[PDB]
Amino acid sequence: SFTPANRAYPYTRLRRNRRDDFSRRLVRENVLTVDDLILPVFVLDGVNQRESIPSMPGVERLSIDQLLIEAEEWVALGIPALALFPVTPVEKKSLDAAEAYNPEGIAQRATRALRERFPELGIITDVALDPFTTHGQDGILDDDGYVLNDVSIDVLVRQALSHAEAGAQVVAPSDMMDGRIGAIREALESAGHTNVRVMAYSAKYASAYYGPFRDAVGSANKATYQMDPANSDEALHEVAADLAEGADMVMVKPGMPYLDIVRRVKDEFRAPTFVYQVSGEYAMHMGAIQNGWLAESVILESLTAFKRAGADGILTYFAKQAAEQLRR
Amino acid sequence: FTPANRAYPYTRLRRNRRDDFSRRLVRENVLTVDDLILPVFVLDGVNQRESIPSMPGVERLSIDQLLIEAEEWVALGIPALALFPVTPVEKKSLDAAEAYNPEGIAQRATRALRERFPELGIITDVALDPFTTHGQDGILDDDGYVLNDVSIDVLVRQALSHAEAGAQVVAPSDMMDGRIGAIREALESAGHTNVRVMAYSAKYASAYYGPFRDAVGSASNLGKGNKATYQMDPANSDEALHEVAADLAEGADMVMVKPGMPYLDIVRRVKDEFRAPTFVYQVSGEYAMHMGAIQNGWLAESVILESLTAFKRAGADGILTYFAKQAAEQLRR
Amino acid sequence: FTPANRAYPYTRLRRNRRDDFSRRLVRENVLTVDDLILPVFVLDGVNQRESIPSMPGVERLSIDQLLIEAEEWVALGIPALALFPVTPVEKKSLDAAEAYNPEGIAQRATRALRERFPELGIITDVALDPFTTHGQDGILDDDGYVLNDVSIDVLVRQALSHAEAGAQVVAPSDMMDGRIGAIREALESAGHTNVRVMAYSAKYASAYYGPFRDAVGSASNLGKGNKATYQMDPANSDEALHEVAADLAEGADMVMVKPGMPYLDIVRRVKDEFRAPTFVYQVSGEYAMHMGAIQNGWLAESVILESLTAFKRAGADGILTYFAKQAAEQLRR
Amino acid sequence: SFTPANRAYPYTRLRRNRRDDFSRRLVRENVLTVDDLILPVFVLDGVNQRESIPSMPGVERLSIDQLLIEAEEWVALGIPALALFPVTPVEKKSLDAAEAYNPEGIAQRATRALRERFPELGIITDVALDPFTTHGQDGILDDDGYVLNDVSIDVLVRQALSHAEAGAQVVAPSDMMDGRIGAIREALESAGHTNVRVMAYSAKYASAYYGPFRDAVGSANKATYQMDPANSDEALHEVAADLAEGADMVMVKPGMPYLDIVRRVKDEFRAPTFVYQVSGEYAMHMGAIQNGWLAESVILESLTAFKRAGADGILTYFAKQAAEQLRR
Amino acid sequence: FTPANRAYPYTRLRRNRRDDFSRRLVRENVLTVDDLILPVFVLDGVNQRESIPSMPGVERLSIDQLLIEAEEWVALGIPALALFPVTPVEKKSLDAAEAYNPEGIAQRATRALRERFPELGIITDVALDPFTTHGQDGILDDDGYVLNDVSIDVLVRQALSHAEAGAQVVAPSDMMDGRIGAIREALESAGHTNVRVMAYSAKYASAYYGPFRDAVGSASNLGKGNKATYQMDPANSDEALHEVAADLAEGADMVMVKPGMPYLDIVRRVKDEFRAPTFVYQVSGEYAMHMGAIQNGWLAESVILESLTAFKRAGADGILTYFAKQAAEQLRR
Amino acid sequence: SFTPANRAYPYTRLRRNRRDDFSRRLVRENVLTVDDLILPVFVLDGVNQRESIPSMPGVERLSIDQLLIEAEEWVALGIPALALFPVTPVEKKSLDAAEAYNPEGIAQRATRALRERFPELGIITDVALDPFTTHGQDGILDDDGYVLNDVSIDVLVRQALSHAEAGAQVVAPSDMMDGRIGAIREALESAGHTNVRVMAYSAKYASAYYGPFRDAVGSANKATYQMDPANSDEALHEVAADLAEGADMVMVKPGMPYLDIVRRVKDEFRAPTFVYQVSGEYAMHMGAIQNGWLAESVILESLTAFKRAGADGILTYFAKQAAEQLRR
Ligand SMILES: [Cl-]
Ligand SMILES: [Cl-]
Ligand SMILES: [Cl-]
Ligand SMILES: [Cl-]
Ligand SMILES: [Cl-]
Ligand SMILES: [Cl-]
Ligand SMILES: [Mg+2]
Ligand SMILES: [Mg+2]
Ligand SMILES: [Mg+2]
Ligand SMILES: [Mg+2]
Ligand SMILES: [Mg+2]
Ligand SMILES: [Mg+2]
Ligand SMILES: [Mg+2]
Ligand SMILES: [Mg+2]
Ligand SMILES: [Mg+2]
Ligand SMILES: [Mg+2]
Ligand SMILES: [Mg+2]
Ligand SMILES: [Mg+2]
Ligand SMILES: [Mg+2]
Ligand SMILES: [Mg+2]
Ligand SMILES: [Mg+2]
Ligand SMILES: [Mg+2]
Ligand SMILES: [Mg+2]
Ligand SMILES: [Mg+2]
Ligand SMILES: [Mg+2]
Ligand SMILES: [Mg+2]
Ligand SMILES: [Mg+2]
Ligand code: NA
Ligand code: NA
Ligand code: NA
Ligand code: NA
Ligand code: NA
Ligand code: NA
């Protein structure tokens, strides 16, 4: 913990280390690097296609060919990994979310293309039913319109397996179903996919910050599976379970509104810990920068906060801008 | 923490989430009006109201207008205001003498509020940059560096002038070393036994302060010194513990982390380690980015209470927030 | 630590190791140029460069040559130098007066560097043995023992002379009790408010110092006193905590563990318990044994960055290392 | 943890205990003894054979008969145990590492000879595939040249069993395969080898310090199984797993470059904890001593550091020299 | 502690116990001669040796005889002696003046030993009851209670007299509050900078002291006051922490728990919480009961090393033991 | 843990509470009561029989009828429980320790008699093979003379079951076999003896203090199962295992020489914790009291130490004397 060691003014003046750039640099506790950045990308069905997102200024949905073009720069900048989010055509959506495990679904096609062209680039696929359900709910519904836990997991498992077969190095189960990490881990192990990583969305909150992402993927009672914003202790039980079930990495979502949770998770478990700077966080910052209300320097400051809080890796729509600034 | 071997399917964390009643039972934290502090920008003159473009919905108010608005703040049960005077350009000087003028805006406003609303807490701002022509946070040496101890001598006089005006709380916001002890020693020696000191303990060198600078007219002074010689490096967490430990030893009744949401890990650490009354400032940048996104239709209004709930969950006792009135109103209902 | 019941085959720790990208994501620590301090050996005279056989690739440099080399150090972004003067035999005395001579090598070098490279940190060495004829680390009593408090009176004058020369940091390296407090009190009383003190807190009685002694010409004095009466016994871990606690109470801005790699457990304990800016010296012996093995072809060059990464993993904020330039160059690329 | 107890100069002067030899001796926190030393030995195939190792000055590879001769002195000095490393003849190397479990392999022959002649001397055998593969990799390779985890374990298990049958009191699995301690433990238990100790190489790093050992055994992507030098938290998960799987002792490797890891491991688990002062550490010290750059006293100082850090036992090529100095 | 889910039959704790070599490897603690302090009873006169019936094998020795025996103690490497003078009845007084007599037994013995055996540590006993006619541990008020502060004034003079005689360590054994600070302040003011103070910090009101009282002739004074007004209640554990914390703050270089084996939990707590040099006294009662049982043939001689190993396992750095010579001899072999 | 709270002389004087009996009584942290005492008793085969034990002054071996007589007083004094140790006739000793589970063995006969006459008195039976083996070793021997772990457990299990059938409320497995608590617990549960307590000898050391007990029971390499006196951390692993295996109470043995272990065990596990003040401890104290070297008050002081260290219950040959003093 912490021992103040009887430090007292004027013997102790904390301004001394702050006096010069060189000593500030020497004592600086944390630094952000390109190794910490994961770029989420919205993937379209077509060819030679890009779309602008109204609530995410500067962010484009990209067909796979456009994705391959942009990825050259992302690789050149040293961005270790992408998180793929397909924009599913409405005709492919169903009550059984079968498109989730379609070997020729966008996510699967995108993964195969990227694994071939950029063998060193990390590909993190999204294991979730809501891009594929007609109702846009995060799983299979019962008569009452409730999301069924275990039946939803059966689909997630087939989906995760389809992603491993496409070559994804990481699968990221994002729908907050209980026990899903264990079921997905059992299935990957039994199928011989020993080295496929599982990045669990462990402490994912029922948040208003997800607004712009719903515009991005075309999907605009979550309180029955996503966490209540008020709860902190509960996040520890979520992470403990996912680690026991075999997650290689655990995530807190949203990010900056939940930095205390990041801190508690890294302190308690000492495991690889990730944080999602969500679409609302990006849009809030971008909106204030374009309005000329905040300096562009808030981008790096916001990312530094994640590192200081204990995060190993950050999912951020700012990943390319950040990488550029870090280099130059 | 002990996980107690909890395992799916015996443990399913969705069961408590199934219904509103059980979510309510297990809910770990709640925000109330008792948690809110409203910062207010105070003009000289009479019948003055000015909109702040970078802070949509926030007005600078002359004192007469402040008193009128305060009726509604008190009616909503908001426990305290933090006063930030908008100092006329002509009253800035090298020596920051306006800081301790009994007829300064902060002193006049404090006297008016204390008389009109005796139960409303008034938190005054103990700082020199509103009163310096160069806009730096203290008195400069011949190298252009802020002199620590000389600045404190001015801060002390100012804090005493606030105590004399009736302020229940003084909040020293310029990051000078040892200033909490010096101000406390002066308050004690002068008989102001119960004047609270709310220390800005862990206050970071931040880009989130942009709109406040627009509100008080300081933005064009930013380049004329280096705030990194006293404000904390955003990278530093352990250092916050040392800041807080010193302010508690020096007599602070409350300790504060500034900025807010970008520093929620620091709020957590500070509350966990010291178990003291812990405050957090949701700064002008944070307000602006939320407001901009809400006005754009990019974010639902519900993000306001989500952002404030976060401060409570992280361990804060009170939150200085430009959303205080909007929040109290929703609460309230 | 809670293991969280992780069990093979559900948990396979090789999955994160499978690819470079995932290794990069989970990597816990990185070394940067911000972490490096270069010690330099400083000669009297002009156009002097001398190779040190027991430290392959290290040169003692006259000040003119130091300034020339410093251009490259600054260009690589190395934040600071630690200066070690090579005192002429004739300037050694019983009273160590050369320590505080404004025209001593350390003072002249500091003044030259501060003028030429204003942003480069200069860490001076506060110690008496470079200036004593007997080569012991302080002033001797009639029993041949180093007098604690009398030595401190000389160290104080020397630290003041460094502050007057412009040094941003003084580093008291002779293990006298209470010396941090005495030097700090003197700096404060004289107005050197911002002069940092980098305490050699947990400095051990070590055989790894051999080559440094060759560098500064002290090897033949080793037998003339007992360093074990002030330097720490290598067996003692708990004792380091007490050393550091005292130096922090006495005002050190940074605390240091010496030797480095053979004492990485101490770095860990010190960082864990105090959460303060923590420094480590990768001493001359450590440099020499790595260099000797690399030159022999017994070890790959990559051991340099491995050794330095270890300091970061153990909890060090900064590393004093004769590899600083070689490391910065690799980094850099 | 730690309470400074308001100790202050001049009331507290830490030099007082340092004043005289007798009080230094009284407060000395740790002492190295011969009980802490394990001697690694490189074992040749022949008779009347010894070889010098260019990068390990003073260290000889020894035929088993020479080993028996030298062991008399090691036993007389009180060295509790040897760690055997066979120097496999190139003709015995294969893709299936079958020589690993050959009842007449060097390790097995050496063990039987030593167990008979010096019944009280601890014998620690090396459970590893790399001395036996043609490719010198630490396991069985797939098409991509990747080391297969579970298939490699199947061989390790047969090897460990062959060592128990030869009489080894300890087997030491050194190849960083996940779950191998558990598999080896299952097999030893099922075969009735209840008392055979398992000394797990738990936190073994992807290190440059292993250079001279590769010269010693004739073997000059490890990053896919050996630990990244940057990682500390990760070492706790490695040790927790090996303890749960049944290790009687856990090891950190390299040694002095990883003393912080030794400290964390002993503090967290309070289990028998070992550390390997590797070939590079030995060569670095020996090179500087022979160059006359460092006093021979660094040997004892380096070993003292392991004790102070929390190690119960130390694998060190300095074991005989250290034992001699400790006695005389 | 984390159990790490270890479970039979995967974990069998008998495997490490199977052979001597593996037992040796995992052995957590060892006793060495460096851990031993021998208490010795010192007579006035010349050519005096007296057997102590309640302490079989222990002799009181005149100084000449002490010096002769000390040759063997030094040859075995025993680091220090604790001296306990057997004060002649005629030299006891109300004012305990004999305590600070430069010609007292303790002072004479210290001077003789320091000259003859310069490397042997001498720990003198700072206490008043050997010098009072009533045998109570300090100066009495008119109610028959030991006056705390007045007793300290005598203890200080005595500690100074020991420092002047050459003692490297003084050990204040009478349980007066604040005595460590007062003695340290006096030693510091007088220039005895390096005289160690070994505090009897947590010393209990014990029945195990019986035979020592026979050794020094105090048994018949026990009823003439109440030791429970300064010695600790055997029931109290938390209280020991407060005793030790105070003695460390007051400047003790070593802290001690008394009795020994009946208080091994206290040794553990004290070492765990303070991480300071920690000593334990295996008192006369403990020696006597072991000796009696060994002489009876009820216990094997091996219990001696078992009892001493316990002190090391519990966290002691050094052990004051009447078995020191017997132990060193076995060790040794 | 502990906060000194800046307490300083003369503001703090710890002698103040020590000034008067009443305040000493108020702050007294621990008190010994008759509820803390368990009396070990040596039980003979005959009728109207008692024997004196040379190395345990004042202690008698008693036939069951004499035991019943003495038990009236023990019950009247409030002693909660006895620990029975039969003195097995040499003719009943064997290589297979079959007498251990004889329904008419001394322990079984004694238990049935006491359970009937004093239904409220706790009876703690000894689950151990050494009173029943010809060789007096603590289990069944292999060819090498080593005590077999799992084969010894098979006998212990039958013995524990015979004690439950005789009515013993507690069985106390005293032989240091690994896993025995679990095996005994499995067997008691399967047989329907749900409420039979298991008092594990968890941290039992290879001690010289057991001498007089061996005289008492007629039995004068234990280092291969009993704990090395030097080891403390190891005791935590012993207790953790016994608790997981189902022990209702855990014990440290010897007692006063191991009070630090008592402290660590109670602090770490917060479980019912017992300590054995062994025969050597009793004889040492009794010998010094009879010699007139120590006051009889050491008896209470020695017992107080166990309470202060964290023990809930104490096995002590002083139980009747202590009970008498506590009452009067
Ligand atoms: Cl200043
Ligand atoms: Cl500021
Ligand atoms: Cl001195
Ligand atoms: Cl030194
Ligand atoms: Cl008094
Ligand atoms: Cl006393
Ligand atoms: Mg979803
Ligand atoms: Mg979950
Ligand atoms: Mg990190
Ligand atoms: Mg300011
Ligand atoms: Mg401050
Ligand atoms: Mg702006
Ligand atoms: Mg709260
Ligand atoms: Mg020096
Ligand atoms: Mg010091
Ligand atoms: Mg040399
Ligand atoms: Mg660090
Ligand atoms: Mg290998
Ligand atoms: Mg492993
Ligand atoms: Mg150890
Ligand atoms: Mg006394
Ligand atoms: Mg005291
Ligand atoms: Mg007596
Ligand atoms: Mg110890
Ligand atoms: Mg037995
Ligand atoms: Mg056991
Ligand atoms: Mg209790
Ligand atoms: Na990272
Ligand atoms: Na509140
Ligand atoms: Na750094
Ligand atoms: Na050892
Ligand atoms: Na010791
Ligand atoms: Na009890």
Swiss-Prot record, chains B, C, E:
What residues bind 5-aminolevulinate 2, as annotated? 284, 322
Gene Ontology cellular component annotations, sorted alphabetically? cytosol
> Which reaction is this enzyme known to catalyze?
2 5-aminolevulinate = porphobilinogen + 2 H2O + H(+)
The EC code for this enzyme is: 4.2.1.24
Q: Which PROSITE patterns match?
A: D_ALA_DEHYDRATASE
Keyword entries, A-Z? Heme biosynthesis, Lyase, Magnesium, Metal-binding, Porphyrin biosynthesis
| Alphabetical list of CDD domains matching this protein | ALAD_PBGS_aspartate_rich
Active-site positions, per UniProt?
203 (schiff-base intermediate with substrate), 258 (schiff-base intermediate with substrate)
Write out the GO biological process terms.
heme biosynthetic process; porphyrin-containing compound biosynthetic process; protoporphyrinogen IX biosynthetic process
What is a single molecular function from GO for this protein? porphobilinogen synthase activity
Q: Does the keyword Lyase apply?
A: yes
Q: Which residues bind Mg(2+)?
A: 243
| UniProt: 5-aminolevulinate 1 binding residues | 213, 227
- Provide the top EC class: lyase
User: What Pfam families does UniProt report for this protein, alphabetically?
Assistant: ALAD
The entry summarizes how activity is regulated as:
Stimulated by magnesium ions.
Biochemical pathway = Porphyrin-containing compound metabolism; protoporphyrin-IX biosynthesis; coproporphyrinogen-III from 5-aminolevulinate: step 1/4
**Which co-factors does it depend on?**
Mg(2+)
NCBIfam families assigned to the protein according to its UniProt record, in alphabetical order: PRK09283.1 (NF006762)
Function per UniProt? Catalyzes an early step in the biosynthesis of tetrapyrroles. Binds two molecules of 5-aminolevulinate per subunit, each at a distinct site, and catalyzes their condensation to form porphobilinogen.
What is the similarity comment for this entry?
Belongs to the ALAD family.
Q: How does it assemble?
A: Homooctamer; formed by oligomerization of dimers.
State the name under which the record lists this protein: Delta-aminolevulinic acid dehydratase
Which lineage do the record's taxonomy fields give for this organism? Answer: Bacteria, Pseudomonadati, Pseudomonadota, Gammaproteobacteria, Pseudomonadales
What gene codes for this chain?
Answer: hemB
